[PDB]
Design a protein around this ligand. Structure first.
Ligand SMILES: Nc1ncnc2c1nc(Cl)n2[C@@H]1O[C@H](CO)[C@@H](O)[C@H]1O
Length: 385
């Protein structure tokens, strides 16, 4: 029953996703708000702890006590220059507990501090409960994914997050490996198969090159930008619309925190529409000083606004190829991961770079990692019996 069942969890930087493999198919499980992915956010309020959508939904009202980006801290020492640099950009407090970072917040009127693995365990507990509501019984066996570049300390702290969350961690597997499994790229028989995974998420960009030799995965190269993602594209749209509001009304809205956040969420929404329509409409009632902001933007203008950022995704692709010592024509498969890979201009730039090649994109790119983890979790629980 429950003991013969296992879930696959993509514990992402900005969003998490859970899947289950049963009756010959992967089911990506929707949360209680009907969303197939859940924000990797934990909010501490005057009455409760919120996880996911409810936590992300009140981030503007409670920024000091809304934790996100715990994955950037997990398995790291406080003195790590990555931690010291990131801390300057977070509205929540990060404290030092014997060279270990803790996020410090106000919860039910009291000061509390949490290890990154405790924050990530709250996200994992939510994914576990989302799976349990779908299945109708508690599932505790899980495969949890991590970036291919995670070291042993980061892998161990992710496993620790799983244990705190009440999950039996069958295995910690690499995100690009789970994506290659999702497309069945490890079941093509014999001979070395070179796979490139292009993973453009909400806040990070990862390029991975893998060689699959008779089911055995080998990481040949990892490249990318840990601070490039979908939210940089939302921010480019925001600057455009702030400048358009200034041209139409001779008013600067950039200082009105509420106006900027309402514009940001509307921009993120319009950006998604631009992946399937050649225009998107913004409909903001009373954006600033009672002025409605009803406008539109073409896909051509959005592509111009992010042109340099889209083009920058090709440097880590070239870098990964040189590190792996492979030319373009030596790559057998190209896999898209992350919601931002739905952007037509991004697909076109990657396909043209690989000389007109087809892209593996039939699986929802923000779901491919959980899909593969779910497949692996099923194989692993079956072998355990
Ligand atoms: N249809 C889409 N067109 C463009 N961007 C998209 C799309 N869907 C998602 Cl999710 N994202 C973005 O992916 C990230 C999460 O993986 C977020 O930045 C989200 O906006």
């Amino acid at each position: 029953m429950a003991k013969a069942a296992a879930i696959g969890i993509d514990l992402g930087t900005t969003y998490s996703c859970v899947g289950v493999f049963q009756h010959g198919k992967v089911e990506i499980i929707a949360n209680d708000q009907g969303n197939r992915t859940t924000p990797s956010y934990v909010a501490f309020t005057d009455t409760e702890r919120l996880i996911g959508d409810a936590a992300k939904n009140q981030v503007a009202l409670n920024p000091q006590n809304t934790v996100f980006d715990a994955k950037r801290l997990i398995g790291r020492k406080f003195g790590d220059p990555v931690v010291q640099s990131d801390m300057k950009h977070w509205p929540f407090q990060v404290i030092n507990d014997g060279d270990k970072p803790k996020v410090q917040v106000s919860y039910k009127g009291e000061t509390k501090a949490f290890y990154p693995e405790e924050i990530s365990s709250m996200v994992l507990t939510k994914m576990k409960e989302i799976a349990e509501a779908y299945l109708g019984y508690p599932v505790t066996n899980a495969v949890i994914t991590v970036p291919a570049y995670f070291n042993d300390s980061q892998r161990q702290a992710t496993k620790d997050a799983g244990v705190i969350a009440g999950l039996n961690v069958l295995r910690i597997i690499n995100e690009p490996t789970a994506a290659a499994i999702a497309y069945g790229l490890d079941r093509t028989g014999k001979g070395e198969r070179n796979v490139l995974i292009f993973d453009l998420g909400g806040g990070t960009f990862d390029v991975s090159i893998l060689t699959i030799d008779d089911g055995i995965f080998e990481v040949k190269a990892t490249a990318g930008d840990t601070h490039l993602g979908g939210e940089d594209f939302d921010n480019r749209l925001v600057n455009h619309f702030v400048e358009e509001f200034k041209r139409k009304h001779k008013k600067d809205i950039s200082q009105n925190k509420r106006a900027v956040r309402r514009l940001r969420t509307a921009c993120e929404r319009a950006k998604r529409t631009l992946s399937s329509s050649t225009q998107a409409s913004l409909e903001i009632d009373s954006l600033f000083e009672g002025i409605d902001f009803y406008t539109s933007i073409t896909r051509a203008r959005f592509e111009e606004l992010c042109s340099d950022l889209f083009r920058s995704t090709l440097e880590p692709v070239e870098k990964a190829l040189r590190d792996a010592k492979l030319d373009k024509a030596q790559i057998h498969d190209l896999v898209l991961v992350g919601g931002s890979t739905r952007i037509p201009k991004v697909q076109k730039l990657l396909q043209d770079f690989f000389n007109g090649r087809d892209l593996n994109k039939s699986i929802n790119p923000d779901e491919a990692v959980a899909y593969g983890a779910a497949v692996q979790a099923a194989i692993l629980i079956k072998s355990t019996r």
